[PDB]
Design a protein around this ligand. Structure first.
Ligand SMILES: [K+]
Ligand SMILES: [Mg+2]
Ligand SMILES: [Mg+2]
Lengths: 49, 49, 92, 354, 21, 144, 56, 95
RNA sequence: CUCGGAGCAGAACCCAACCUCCGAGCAGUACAUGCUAAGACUUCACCAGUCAAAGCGAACUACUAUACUCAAUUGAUCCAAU
């Protein structure tokens, strides 16, 4: 997907870039995702005490 | 293997069993020239012995 | 049946019921299961060793402060906040 | 080969001829604020929200609650501005704020918040917990009648029920003390349902409590349509939701079909669905108040199963999917010796025919 | 990607004045 | 002679959205290491400061606001000389901490900037939350 | 292949376990005394340089 | 390789192989990584752990190592307290 | 004559000339650059090389923190020293 790119404030290089941009301008970058297919687990009946 | 040999009459449990009786019953094949020092009794099959 | 078992001591009987309440069924029988081996012998030996460990722990009465588990740490914080919400009756 | 954009591209309205004369952000905070705004807008390209955002229905949620109260904004605004002037005029207030020693009375803030923004904050919080999705199949209402449920613990303490705070089954052993503000001659219906307690059916609930035709706010005088049953969350099953739903009856209603035998200790009889119950009584009934808490298993639940319900206690366990390994190959080149353990069922030596 | 309509969505150096030592 | 009450499904269905979160077994959204802020949380405290007001939000990672406290509310505004100073920020923390406990939220992450974290306003708001019972760090997810 | 500015030295644990690790230090600087994790005792212990392995 | 010895007319074993490789009875060969004792001061911990691994050989290498050793080295052995005893037989291997 | 970056080779990967250009054979900071372990990459083989969740042990009370910065910054087997 294409997402808005906000760098870390500790990132000196990237922060200097955005502060010099004209107002109303937003940087974009391509991001890669992984949509989880399976759940973390399932509750199963283990005993009848 | 020990139980199987006894059930078929190939090893006689009414007398003391040793290396000779196991060899004469074709239960185990010992190769002293290949650095075999005898037989090790292993626990496989303990539940049904 | 834990309560009926006379070979265990009475104080030990009463302390095992509290510590291992999760292993006692409706009828009061303490159920122990081991499925870590292929051989019934070793599985039984493990079950018997657990019984011997239960009696040893109850009789020892250890007062040493054990290290808190991670799951327990969160429940401690959650219990604190639940007690913090407790109110008192305006007119008791 | 090129393809024209399907819509307006980012950074398009920026005039690049007057770049030097255009205003810059100059601050990280001003860019972030604009960045957060752009991320929320709909886009014609693929976005994270498309794949991970919950798929809300386009049609708005049907409101089934009481009508909003009518307030005179002009008079309300006048009184509010006057109060601020009086507070700001006090010299002792200014010094306390300047010296950072001032504080607000939390007790008064909650009383005012409960009258003003309380209902909407409770609705927002009820929607987050999934009550409207489960209880009314997505239909939402504003709990405009504050409901105060408290479980008496001991003789001098109370355990208040708010909106998701945890209450243990031991504390909820007996019926709670329910009080709400109601006019004379009105009728109300109060119920308690466990959204997650049901053992056999996933979509069904358990009706722990039902009181009908309550005169005014005298809950004790209501008809016990269903007797009270303490929560019994099963061990290892997680944290359940129990919701108190207050209803405002337009006229006296007959709940003979919903009547449960006293005592009711059959889980089949307790099985209950709020949507079906409200749907049949919707014409003469409106949701007014809402409270709920979160309940997990404790040692007292064993008492409920063994004695009250006369059944064996069901225990559950969170089971994770088995670990994945690629298909075993005859020659696992450059793999460590522990490769073979990954595909081994038992850890004990095997001897085959011998 | 070049052929796709979103080509150039990540461009940013035309929005900044060039830096010359 | 089976007991009707003992009819239990082999798999338990718990529709509580917070169930797995409270067991610390739910997935947190890991990744996003090159951007700010992180997504690896279930709940986060987010403070919005404007020219006239101070607002603090507790929102789930999915973007839903759970609880909120703002100086725009009359319940809070009526007791504040100024809604834009350090006292206002400390008061918002105290009000939010109480509302968090009533909603069942005991843990959240706070993601300040370097200048925000060093500010006296945010330090007083954080102290108010911790004194109120809320812990500003979340427990580690259990994977095993 | 260049001027030898650093040297490799063996740091020996002071716990008496005998666990050693190799570190790089400047030739002109003084002998290193470092606090380094000792696996034998399973906690951080003081190490002291004993010998110079080679010139780097 | 000596296919027919002058004294016995029998195939010989290349002893260089015996000194470097372990043969599991299932047919797999185990070796060490080249350079796992070389210039450790300039290698990272992740790399050094990889170098300490006991790894398997591929099909082509295994076939070559089988040709370079006689049948004696492919027999089933029952050494007492053998560390590699468990790895001699494969389990749940389809093809 | 080995290694890395760029063009040729414009967009997954790969691609030659006694083709066109620029570099490397370190340095600096750590002293948990501790241990261990799923799943993967791979310079077209092999050798070598690369990235890593969880876990143990630490660290921690927000220094873009737990596989340091850096592009290459390098040498197999035997043998020798210990
Ligand atoms: K359920
Ligand atoms: Mg390859
Ligand atoms: Mg890790």
């Amino acid at each position: 997907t294409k997402e808005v790119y906000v760098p870390h404030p500790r990132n000196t290089e990237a922060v200097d870039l955005i502060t010099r941009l004209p107002k109303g301008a937003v940087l974009y970058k391509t991001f890669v995702h992984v949509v989880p297919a399976k759940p973390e687990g399932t509750f199963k009946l283990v005993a009848m005490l | 293997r020990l139980q199987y040999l006894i059930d078929l009459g190939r090893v006689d449990p009414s007398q003391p069993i040793d290396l000779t009786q196991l060899v004469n019953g074709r239960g185990v094949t010992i190769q002293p020239l290949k650095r075999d020092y005898g037989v090790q009794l292993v626990e496989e099959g303990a539940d049904t012995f | 049946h834990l309560a009926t078992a006379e070979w265990i001591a009475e104080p030990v009987r009463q302390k095992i019921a509290i510590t291992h309440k999760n292993k006692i069924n409706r009828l009061g029988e303490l159920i122990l299961t081991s499925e870590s081996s292929r051989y019934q012998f070793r599985n039984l030996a493990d079950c018997l060793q657990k019984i011997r460990d239960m009696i040893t722990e109850a009789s020892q009465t250890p007062k040493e402060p054990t290290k808190e588990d991670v799951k327990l740490h969160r429940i401690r914080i959650e219990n604190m906040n639940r007690e913090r919400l407790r109110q008192k009756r305006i007119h008791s | 080969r090129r393809t024209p954009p399907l819509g307006p591209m980012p950074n398009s309205d920026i005039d690049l001829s007057n770049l030097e004369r255009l205003e810059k952000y100059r601050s990280f905070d001003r860019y972030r604020r604009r960045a957060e705004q752009e991320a929320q807008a709909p886009h014609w390209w693929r976005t994270y929200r498309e794949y991970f955002g919950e798929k809300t229905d386009p049609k708005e949620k049907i409101d089934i609650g009481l009508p909003p109260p009518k307030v005179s904004r002009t008079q309300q605004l006048l009184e509010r501005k006057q109060a601020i002037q009086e507070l700001r005029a006090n010299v002792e207030e200014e010094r306390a704020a300047r010296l950072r020693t001032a504080s607000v009375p939390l007790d008064a803030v909650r009383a005012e918040w409960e009258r003003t923004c309380g209902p909407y904050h409770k609705q927002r919080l009820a929607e987050y917990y999934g009550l409207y999705r489960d209880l009314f199949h997505g239909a939402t209402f504003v709990p405009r009648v504050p409901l105060h449920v408290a479980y008496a613990v001991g003789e001098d303490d109370l355990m208040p029920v708010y909106c998701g705070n945890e209450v243990t089954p031991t504390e909820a052993a007996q019926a709670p003390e329910v009080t709400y503000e109601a006019e004379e001659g009105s009728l109300w219906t109060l119920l308690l349902t466990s959204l997650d307690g049901h053992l056999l059916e996933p979509d069904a609930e358990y009706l722990h409590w039902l009181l009908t035709n309550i005169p005014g706010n005298r809950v004790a005088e209501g008809q016990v349509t269903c007797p009270y049953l303490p929560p019994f969350p099963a061990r290892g099953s997680g944290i359940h939701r129990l919701a108190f739903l207050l209803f405002k009856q337009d006229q006296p209603i007959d709940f003979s079909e919903d009547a449960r035998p006293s005592p009711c200790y059959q889980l089949a009889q307790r099985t209950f669905r709020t949507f079906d119950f409200y749907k049949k009584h919707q014409e003469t009934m409106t949701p007014a108040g809402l409270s709920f808490f979160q309940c997990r298993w404790d040692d007292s639940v064993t008492y409920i199963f063994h004695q009250l319900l006369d059944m064996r206690e069901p225990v559950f366990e969170f089971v994770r999917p088995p670990p994945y390994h690629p298909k075993q190959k005859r020659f696992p080149h450059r793999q460590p010796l522990r490769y073979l353990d990954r595909y081994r069922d038992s850890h004990e030596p095997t001897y085959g025919i011998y | 990607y070049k052929t796709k309509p979103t080509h150039g969505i990540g461009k940013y150096k035309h929005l900044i004045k060039a830096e010359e030592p | 002679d089976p007991v009707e009450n003992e009819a239990v499904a082999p798999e338990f269905t718990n529709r509580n959205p917070r169930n797995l979160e409270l067991l610390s077994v739910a997935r947190k959204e890991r990744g996003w290491r090159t951007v700010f802020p992180s997504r690896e949380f279930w709940h986060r405290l987010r403070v919005i400061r404007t020219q006239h007001h101070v607002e603090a939000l507790v929102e789930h990672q999915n973007g839903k606001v759970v609880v909120s406290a703002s100086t725009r509310e009359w319940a809070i505004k009526k007791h504040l000389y100024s809604t834009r100073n350090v006292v206002a920020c400390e008061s918002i923390g105290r009000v939010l901490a109480q509302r968090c406990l009533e909603a069942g939220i005991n843990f959240m992450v706070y993601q300040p900037t370097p200048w925000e974290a060093a500010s006296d306003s945010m330090k007083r708001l954080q102290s108010a939350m911790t004194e109120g019972g809320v812990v500003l760090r979340e427990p580690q997810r259990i994977y095993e | 292949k260049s001027k030898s500015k650093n040297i490799l030295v063996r740091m020996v644990s002071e716990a008496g376990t005998g666990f050693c690790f190799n570190t790089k230090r400047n030739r002109l600087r003084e002998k290193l005394t470092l606090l380094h994790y000792d696996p034998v005792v399973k906690q951080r212990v003081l190490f002291v340089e004993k010998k110079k392995i080679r010139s780097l | 390789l000596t296919y027919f010895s002058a004294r016995k007319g029998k195939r010989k074993t290349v002893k260089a192989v015996i000194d470097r490789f372990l043969r599991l009875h299932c047919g797999l060969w185990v070796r060490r990584k080249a350079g796992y004792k070389k210039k450790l001061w300039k290698k990272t911990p992740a790399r050094k752990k990889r170098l300490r691994e006991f790894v398997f050989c591929n099909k082509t290498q295994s076939k070559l190592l089988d040709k370079m050793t006689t049948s004696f080295w492919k027999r089933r052995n029952w050494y007492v307290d053998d560390p590699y005893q468990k790895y001699h037989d494969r389990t749940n291997l389809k093809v």
